[PDB]
Amino acid sequence: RECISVHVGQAGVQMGNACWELYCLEHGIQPDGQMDDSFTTFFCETGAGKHVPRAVFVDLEPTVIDEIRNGPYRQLFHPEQLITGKEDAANNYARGHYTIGKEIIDPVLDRIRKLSDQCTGLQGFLVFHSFGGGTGSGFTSLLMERLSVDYGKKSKLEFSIYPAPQVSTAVVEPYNSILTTHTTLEHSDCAFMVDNEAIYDICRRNLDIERPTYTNLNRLISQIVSSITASLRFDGALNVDLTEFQTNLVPYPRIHFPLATYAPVISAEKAYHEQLSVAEITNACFEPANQMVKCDPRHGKYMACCLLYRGDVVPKDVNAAIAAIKTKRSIQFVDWCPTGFKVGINYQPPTVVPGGDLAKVQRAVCMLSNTTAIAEAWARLDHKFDLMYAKRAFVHWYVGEGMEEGEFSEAREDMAALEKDYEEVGI
Amino acid sequence: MREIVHIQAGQCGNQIGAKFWEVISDEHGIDPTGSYHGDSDLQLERINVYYNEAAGNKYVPRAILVDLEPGTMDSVRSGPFGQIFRPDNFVFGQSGAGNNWAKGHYTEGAELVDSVLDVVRKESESCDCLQGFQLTHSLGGGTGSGMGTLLISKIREEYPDRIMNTFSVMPSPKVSDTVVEPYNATLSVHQLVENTDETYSIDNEALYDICFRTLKLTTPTYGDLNHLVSATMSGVTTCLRFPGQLNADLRKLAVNMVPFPRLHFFMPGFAPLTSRGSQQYRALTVPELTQQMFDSKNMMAACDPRHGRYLTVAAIFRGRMSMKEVDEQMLNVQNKNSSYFVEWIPNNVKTAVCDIPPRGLKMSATFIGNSTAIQELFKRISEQFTAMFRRKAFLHWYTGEGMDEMEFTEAESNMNDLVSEYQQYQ
Amino acid sequence: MREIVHIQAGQCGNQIGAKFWEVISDEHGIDPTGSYHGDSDLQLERINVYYNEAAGNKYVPRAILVDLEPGTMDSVRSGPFGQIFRPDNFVFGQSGAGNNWAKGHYTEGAELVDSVLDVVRKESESCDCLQGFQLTHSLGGGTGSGMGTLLISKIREEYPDRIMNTFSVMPSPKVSDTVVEPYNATLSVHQLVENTDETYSIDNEALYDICFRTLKLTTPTYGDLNHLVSATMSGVTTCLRFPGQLNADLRKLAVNMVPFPRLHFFMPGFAPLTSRGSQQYRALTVPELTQQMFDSKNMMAACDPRHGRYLTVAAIFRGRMSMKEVDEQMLNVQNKNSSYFVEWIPNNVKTAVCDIPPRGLKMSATFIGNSTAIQELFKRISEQFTAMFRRKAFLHWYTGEGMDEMEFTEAESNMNDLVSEYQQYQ
Amino acid sequence: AECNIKVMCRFRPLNESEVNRGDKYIAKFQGEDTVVIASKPYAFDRVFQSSTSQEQVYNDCAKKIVKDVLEGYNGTIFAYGQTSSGKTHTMEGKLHDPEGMGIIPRIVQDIFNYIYSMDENLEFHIKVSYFEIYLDKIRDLLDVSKTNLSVHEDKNRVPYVKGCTERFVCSPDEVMDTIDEGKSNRHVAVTNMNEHSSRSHSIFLINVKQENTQTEQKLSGKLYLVDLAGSAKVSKTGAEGAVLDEAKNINKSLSALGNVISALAEGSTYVPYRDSKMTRILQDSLGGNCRTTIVICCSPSSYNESETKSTLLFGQRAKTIKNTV
Ligand SMILES: Nc1nc2c(ncn2[C@@H]2O[C@H](COP(=O)(O)CP(=O)(O)OP(=O)(O)O)[C@@H](O)[C@H]2O)c(=O)[nH]1
Ligand SMILES: Nc1nc2c(ncn2[C@@H]2O[C@H](COP(=O)(O)CP(=O)(O)OP(=O)(O)O)[C@@H](O)[C@H]2O)c(=O)[nH]1
Ligand SMILES: Nc1nc2c(ncn2[C@@H]2O[C@H](COP(=O)(O)OP(=O)(O)OP(=O)(O)O)[C@@H](O)[C@H]2O)c(=O)[nH]1
Ligand SMILES: Nc1ncnc2c1ncn2[C@@H]1O[C@H](COP(=O)(O)OP(=O)(O)OP(=O)(O)O)[C@@H](O)[C@H]1O
């Protein structure tokens, strides 16, 4: 059992630098490249007393790549795997897909082929990017389309950072997100999502960090993506694999948008005063403001829900906790899936980074759940897109790259097809 | 990796260009002789983005100084950082233009433009992969507007795909040190509106207005004015000169700020702008900086933004800071002032930050704004041109070089068009 | 948390405002340079309620000094605590008002009021959550009554929900250092009676009357008068600057003292007031303090309360003390003197105490009283205005600024109305 | 004073690349004025079916335009659509054949045939020009030396070309000769969708100046014949290398005039003609003293259903436009 990953954009490599430092300290891998069947999923055996991750950080702009080469984690990652481009995507879906995308996929696509040939138990793929930019939108759809036609049957665990409702980093991110989702709607099996102001709200209230940064945001994100793959690494009472995320969460092949959340988030001084059990954290993850997306779950209905625990959590009190969620009428489940619960447990507990913002806890939980609540966000993104599309704003840059007005209409109607599917399935 | 070819045209362009290499040399820690004496290793990470490597660990700048008056080069060469430039790049004529756009564009420029194209071709092919062109000129005069705008046309013909960036100072009616400003102004914007992808509209009176209120210099010279505008030149190209948590290249700034091919005339700004007698009484936290960035009186253009609506704005921060306080300041600044922002765009702000601030300051940022208030400058410039053109005043000197009066009318046709273009989106 | 924006208008307002920051700086233990050198940790608990944090552990005050005479700021800036204030807050004109309400309200104030509104907006948005405005002015003169009352009207328009507190000194017939006092007085109370929620009526002759009997200073200056009135400014805002067993915010004082929207003109007082030659012969226990608080001659207003009836009174104590002796003193003080208290209210007294007394004193309190005896001041002020207005004396200077004589009559209509309002409840 | 721009449509038969893939014939016609596509009517002035020959399209569309441009007004005809829609065959065709020849030789032949029918005293001065906008440069095809021309304004602020090779012509056969050598110099590339893919916009001008000797009344009319390229998708064409640069400049132009039609349809204030320099040529056609007639071409295959629907609604936005004639 093994799995490979590729990181795209500033959002990907910043999570890439933050997640692989977490994976190395879990398995006792020192940052100099060296220290049985626990690290074989992500890390390889480089002859004798040396390891290499199964990672390929790709990015067109070279500032992030050489910083990793001149960073602290020099000897861990392969120097050849750290791919760098020549010219930035420049916040454009077309530029990272046709001009700069086509001339760099050929080094990239053949690399993941031979990097998979040395492996034998490749379960699937997981990517890291953000559709708010150019390289995260154009190049990501290109490679994911280029490998889906080759492999197809293997899974694809997308991790995209969508823009917030009112907070935003760019101005043309509806154009970047609406075009790349036209290709991602059919090829991606599942895609977990993260938001900007929502994750700031997590560390503001519970973790009381009044001045956080992206370095702190990626740590708890690393706890999420490391905890979902913690079942295949360490032994568990109920082992789950990456293929469970396709069967239990995707009721229809074109409705493949779960939410993401994590608990318990608690500081050092607050950890010793707050009680740690499954009952209080089971209510915390279902709390609406404790999610990683500004979206009201009370408005919609949960299509499916998955739970994955860590640490010394016995199966008694965890089953009594979810039974209290069923009779709690604050949230409402859809009639099309009454038994929409997938429980998981791993024995290895949540770790802690030296000097990190999160505290050590003897147990944790991460919930991924499909719901019809995210239709209003697509309505919001589609609504604001019509305001700029009516004035033809920021269009001359895309057609200057090689595109036209036609596929903008395809990107509009394809999201319009998604809304009528979300209101139909939500009946 | 993504080299930028610098080209200093005109008298003022050589001054701010000379100050531009001065202020960034302290950031990279380069001696005036050309050797490195810095402290950080990241200064050498992206020293090639502006400089070229040479023997003895010497770094010559990729600057091309062009001017039709040899006395200007003697002052730049005899400056503090005058010896670091390449002697071969100092190409220049002998006879000045005398504040005539026709002389520096048709006759006096045409004899020298064959000499400068072979020089910039050397710096272009010598690099690994060129990104764009960072030019400095003035819309007034003949050598800045005539010859500086000419090579913009030739570089567009040779390199139509690269970015054409211009830091251009422009005249105003309150402060006017030249009689032929509106004729030179209206002829220059005809070329800048069609060829260049991005331009920064800097008004000279606002350089004096900002130094009274915030900086309160009692004896300001032109060198003090060059310092604050050259900081903006360092802010726009900070993301590729040093690493950052959210890098924005010059092309990444273009797509967010240039919603239409003609509407690319920006309005720069910079902060912190505080005197020495009031530095201790100010907090370097970002909310005190954000209110100064979007302030109506902080920018280096005299157009008041409250009389119009912002089309799109960008703020490139510098220094280690918290992103939540940075991002949330962009929320309340636009929603509380929704009248001064267009409703047909959901988010007008573009964010960017770097981990390496300027030397001597821990927190700083640069304000970049494309607003519809800039048409007020095009209004007064157009009325000054139409007031002098309607009786053919000061045109017989231009006809001596073979220039036709229809080109002045064609420049006048472009003036009201771009004025009406900004009025469409307000 | 509940910040208070200070605004020093007029000459006297700058003096008592300068003394106000002086006396509280010793309580918080702030150096004149701006650094902290105190002893208690509670001083930093609520230092942000008046000051703003800055680099180097320096605390700049949130003071906005406004005046139409630049010589006043030179004396305040060159004072003991003059260097701690922000230089940007020192906004001021050049030409004085010359004791004319029309000049400082219509012409001389209107050119500067655009400049001060952008300054107070900076201090208002920079805070976490503003509570109110602590203003100091004088009803005499033109810059205090004209421009000071003007921005009260503008702040009411922008912040109608916040508290508008004013420590206003007012003239009297026995001591009158200005001829145009009743004209400036009657025009100022027209704005204070409608806009402000609370006001402290301080009479200048009572500042001299209290220093003869109790303090017996042989050579009193204006600085000695500023010390006793500034202590009252510290007493009103003690509950939110330090913890206490029964905290009363400025809004909590307003609802108890302002029974009707117009009847909010208070009568301050302070104790202990004892000379150095009689300090050893006095007991600091509360009954000797309580009889001094409600004394007819202790207050800083010349209106004798025995000629009327108290509408409502508040006493904010300071220092560690016993509550039974405090509360029981409020019982016998009102029932023994039931003729001097209204029978249509069962309890006129409001209690409050703090655990942190002033430096150098273990027991202290401030007397705050809304009494119907204040109409005697409005009687004599109205008769002085009607005596000069009935033949249009000293009005032609006001008409030069475009002011109408009907506004003087409208101010006269407000004067007899509030006089009759106090007479209704006596 | 005001005349509506005539909007006509034409569908073609399925070419060799579409019938072997198995595309369905979705083109459904209802009379002459309107066409039904996916149960959606689209009203036009005249819709041409697949069986419409070359001569039938010319007599229906551009027959009266020859009379209008000779009366004293201006004329302009251009074709909008996607690649392989049949724009080149409609206008160019095969020039040397009587039947297979397109519109632009038929326009030439009708002008000279009309002059022979007129009296001898009407003296005609016809001068021809031919250039193309390729890689954002106006390269002349009549002369190979100059590769970029300027666009200057005339007396009434109407933009037009300067420096171009204005060949004074006498006989109609000479006009056929300069058209043949011009098309031979045309940079025609090969792609998967069309071997004869015109990768740029060929503008052909016929500046017909005329004056009567008796009345001494001078008249002129600018007759623009524009044959634009196709707004093709990169995934369908499979473009790579130099052809990508050719796709950029054509897509800027069709998107630029797409803003002009939407600006003129919704009735904007500024009407941004100055987005692309190709749009600067078509100012007098859309907002001048001209009688414009747009003829959109589309394919009946199901594989190009999205781009063809965009072309029809683009035609609907063109119906609400009026000239200042
Ligand atoms: N902020 C600064 N502005 C300057 C400086 N020098 C000139 N100027 C301003 O720019 C205006 C015109 O720019 P120039 O001095 O360069 C005139 P130019 O050299 O281009 O033509 P000629 O000298 O006649 O050959 C000028 O009138 C000033 O208002 C300077 O050093 N700093
Ligand atoms: N208790 C104090 N009273 C003062 C002091 N200075 C002045 N005054 C009294 O206040 C009266 C008027 O107040 P001001 O001195 O401020 C006159 P203002 O500055 O507002 O107008 P102009 O000076 O004409 O511009 C004045 O006649 C005094 O009776 C002082 O320092 N302390
Ligand atoms: N949460 C989080 N988001 C990030 C981080 N870094 C980048 N992003 C996201 O990335 C978005 C910008 O898109 P990018 O793909 O990173 O753009 P870029 O890397 O600057 O490259 P260009 O698009 O060419 O300008 C922002 O809106 C962020 O939300 C990060 O470290 N943490
Ligand atoms: N109406 C029609 N009837 C029959 N055949 C046609 C028709 N239109 C086009 N064709 C065929 O298509 C071939 C080439 O098509 P054409 O070059 O016109 O495509 P196009 O879309 O105009 O290309 P471009 O994108 O360069 O404009 C011709 O050789 C011709 O046989």
Residue numbers in the entry:
A (entry chain I): 2 to 36, 52 to 443
B (entry chain Q), C (entry chain P): 1 to 426
D (entry chain Y): 5 to 329
Article, verbatim:
Microtubules are cytoskeletal filaments that play various important roles in cellular processes, including intracellular transport, cell division, and establishment of cell polarity. They are highly dynamic tubular polymers assembled from α/β-tubulin heterodimers, which are arranged in a head-to-tail manner to form protofilaments, with ~13 protofilaments associating laterally to form a hollow polar tube. In vertebrates, both α- and β-tubulins have multiple isotypes encoded by different genes, which are intrinsic factors in regulating microtubule functions. The GTP bound to β-tubulin at the E-site (exchangeable) is hydrolysed within the microtubule assembly proceeding via longitudinal contacts with α-tubulin, while the GTP bound to α-tubulin at the N-site (non-exchangeable) plays a structural role and is never hydrolysed. We determined the cryo-EM maps of α1A/β2A, α1C/β2A, and α4A/β2A microtubules in the dominantly populated 14-protofilament type at the resolution range of 4.2 Å to 4.4 Å.
The tubulin isotype α4A is highly expressed in various tissues, such as the heart, brain and platelets, and is mainly expressed at later stages of development. Moreover, our recent study showed that α4A/β2A microtubules had different microtubule polymerization properties and special curved growth features. To investigate the architectures of α1A/β2A, α1C/β2A, and α4A/β2A microtubules and explore the impact of α-tubulin isotypes on the structural features of the microtubules, we characterized the structures of the three kinds of microtubules in the presence of GMPCPP by using cryo-EM. By superimposing the global Cα of α-tubulin on the left side, we found that for α1C/β2A microtubules, the lateral interaction between α-α and β-β contacts in the non-seam region was similar to that of α1A/β2A contacts, with the Cα atom root mean square deviation (RMSD) lower than 1 Å. This was also the case for α4A/β2A and α1A/β2A microtubules. Surprisingly, similar analysis of α1A/β2A and α4A/β2A microtubules revealed a clear contraction of α4A/β2A relative to the α1A/β2A protofilament. This contraction mainly exists between the longitudinal interdimer, consistent with that observed in the seam region. Additionally, this contraction is in a progressive expanded manner that increases with each dimer along the protofilament, such that the first neighbouring α4A/β2A dimer contracts by ~1.5 Å relative to α1A/β2A microtubules, then the second dimer contracts by 3 Å, and so on. Our structural analysis revealed that, compared with α1A/β2A and α1C/β2A microtubules, α4A/β2A microtubules exhibit longitudinal contraction between tubulin interdimers, which could potentially be related to more amino acid variations between α4A and α1A relative to that between α1C and α1A.
